[PDB]
Amino acid sequence: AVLSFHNICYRVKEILSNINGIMKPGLNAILGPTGGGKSSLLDVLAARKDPSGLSGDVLINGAPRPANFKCNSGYVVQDDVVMGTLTVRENLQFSAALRLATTMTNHEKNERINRVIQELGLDKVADSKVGTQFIRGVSGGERKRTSIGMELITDPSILFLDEPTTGLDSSTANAVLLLLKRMSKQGRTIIFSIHQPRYSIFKLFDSLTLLASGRLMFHGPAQEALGYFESAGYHCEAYNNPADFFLDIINGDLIEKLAEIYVNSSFYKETKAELHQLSGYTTSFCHQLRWVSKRSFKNLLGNPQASIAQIIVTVVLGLVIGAIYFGLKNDSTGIQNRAGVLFFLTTNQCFSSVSAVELFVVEKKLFIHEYISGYYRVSSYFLGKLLSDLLPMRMLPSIIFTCIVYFMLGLKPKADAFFVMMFTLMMVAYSASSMALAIAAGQSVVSVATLLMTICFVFMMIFSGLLVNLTTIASWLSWLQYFSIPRYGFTALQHNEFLGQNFCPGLNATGNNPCNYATCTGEEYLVKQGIDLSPWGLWKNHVALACMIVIFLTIAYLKLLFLKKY
């Protein structure tokens, strides 16, 4: 399969104006400065831009590009987006299970995971972890190689590479770039956009397309690239690199004058002659959930640097709160002391789950790459990570928390009340995290994603029945009490706590008491807060919290589905 393209007009201002060229099933290249359409022409051929501003036609071996061209052709993006906290054997296994297991069996597809493991040369680092900025692993020259084989699993006719030697320590650059020539003998069309090649790959170019400032300068093979400028008016004599010279006419030793002789050159008049002649998901849903979770669950425990940091800070906080209110009694300072701690637990769960914004913003460029390549639907990436990084990461600081703080305090020695506290602590922890998930998904920078959290969760802990006595704010702004997660947690934690206690030893304030403004018995404390004493008045909050989850979850699912991924 060969690629070709004609009269490509791309507008955002036209960033890619008058570009036409033909590829070969060999090893091609897109050179030039990065300010022009160098990166832009590669995404056009990869169908990675949006097709709105495009005008021309990318004709693949005479056929027009179908909609499943993107699932047939890999695209190694610039930065290493491989899963760093996994092993390269499993890292090739992740893509292999998401694009092949429809009709072939398991051990059938096990062949091509090993068949590609020595053509890359990855057998010496096959069973090692990759390597991140938080951990050490395989060297950086083979972080790029496992990116290449990851899209080599599905059988490619075309293979793009966005700048595959940016930050790769050029002593290691030749072996991967010789390896792309070795793949090209079988028929794999390779169209990369290398960044400042010195000389070593420049002898091994089957074609090249230099592009600068949105104007097509030169397209032709590298052996006849030297013989262009020496009869075109631009002398590159000895002690001058040829791959470095070609951009010096743009540097000024005119912005369109460097390319207008290419219209009247001996390349474009016959390249058009071919172009004027040539112009005449896949895997099941339960399997897609089973693999994005298994990748994410292995990524969770594989880097337990911040996951278990949340565990040990939940243990010692529940020990400190346990040491402070150790054996809190039913004296005068019962309502002041046990409504205080229940305020702290719900607002901490509201505030410790600001870290959930760092969920869809680390792997955002990974998700944009893996959705558009066809690994999974958005409904699989979204649901798969909630079962992996949201359920067994917010459930833990509610049952590790409440087993320590409850009996060390002596709140209410029942068996359901220990459970309707553990349930409502994980109900605010799922609700507040999914709220922080909502207004931070589909974003790249967590500057405003944390700025919009920390000034909004203080617009909620005000309206939470401790600092305010909610039934005393006048009604024209007291409607805001319903739009606040910690009110439902605090009230549900108060309703199962102040129901049998009387904070008043030496008397009884059940039915007969003079000298009011007392609040001796516990239910009178709740009616001053306006919390309903009915048993529905506990579970009124949870069905308001469960609706708070699902409302705030589907806006997060929308923001990933309605995200511009081009």
Q: What residues are designated binding site?
A: 32-39, 136-142, 163, 195
Q: Which residues from 458-477 bind its own copies, rule CB under 8 A? A: 458-459, 462, 466-469, 472-474, 477
Q: Do 540 and 532 touch, CB atoms closer than 8 A?
A: yes
What is the Cα–Cα distance from 20 to 115, expressed in whole angstroms?
A: 37
Binding partner of 551, given its own copies, ligand CLR, ligand MIX, none, CB within 5-8 angstroms per partner class: ligand CLR
User: Please, which residue, 403 or 448, has the CB nearer to ligand CLR?
Assistant: 448
What residue type is 136 in one-letter code?
Answer: R
Closest-CA residue to 91 (of 295, 380, 288): 295
Interface with ligand CLR includes 561 (CB under 6 A)? no
Helix (H, G, I), strand (E, B) or coil at 33: coil
d(C-alpha 407, C-alpha 403), whole Å: 7
Contacting its own copies within 70-99 (CB under 8 A):
none
Measured from the CB atom, the residue of 59 and 428 that comes closer to ligand MIX is: 428
3-state helix, strand, coil in the chain (%, to 5): 45, 10, 45
CB of 484 to ligand CLR, least distance (A): 8
**The two structure tokens encoding residue 492:** 């549900």
Structure letter (DSSP) for residue 216: E
**Segment contacting its own copies (CB under 8 A): 21-29, 241-249, 265-273, 297-305?**
241-249
Tell me whether residue 11 or residue 528 sits nearer to its own copies (CB atom).
528
Measured at the CA of 159, the angle between CA 102 and CA 99, to 5 degrees, comes to: 10
483 touches ligand CLR (CB under 6 A): yes
- From its own copies, ligand CLR, ligand MIX, none, which one binds at residue 259 (CB under 5 to 8 Å depending on kind)? none
What token pair was written down for 454?
């920390």
478 binds ligand CLR (CB under 6 A): no
Using rule CB under 8 A, residue 305 touches its own copies: no
Helix or strand run (H / E) with residue 293:
helix 285-302
Rounded Cα distance between 290 and 451, Å, is: 34
Query: Which position has the token pair 């600081």?
Result: 397
Q: Which of residues 497-556 bind ligand CLR (CB under 6 A)?
A: 540, 544, 547-548, 551
Q: What is the DSSP letter of 152?
A: S
Asked whether the beta carbons of 296 and 85 are under 8 A apart, the reply is: no
Is 73:156 a contact under the CB 8 Å cutoff? yes
* Residue 347 found at the interface with ligand MIX (CB under 6 A): yes
β-bridge pairing 57-60 and 3-11: antiparallel
Residue closer to ligand CLR by CB (options 19, 556) is: 556
DSSP state letter for 547 = H
Which residues carry a binding-site annotation for ATP? Answer: 32-39, 136-142, 163, 195
454 sits near ligand MIX (criterion: CB under 6 A) = yes
Q: What is the binding site for ligand CLR (CB under 6 A)?
A: 482-483, 540, 544, 547-548, 551
Q: What is the binding site for its own copies (CB under 8 A)?
A: 170-171, 198-199, 226, 236-242, 244, 250-252, 313, 320-321, 323-326, 328, 331-333, 336-337, 340-341, 343-344, 348, 455, 458-459, 462, 466-469, 472-474, 477, 503-504, 507, 513-515, 517-520, 528
Q: What is the binding site for ligand MIX (CB under 6 A)?
A: 313, 317, 347-348, 351-352, 354, 454-455, 458
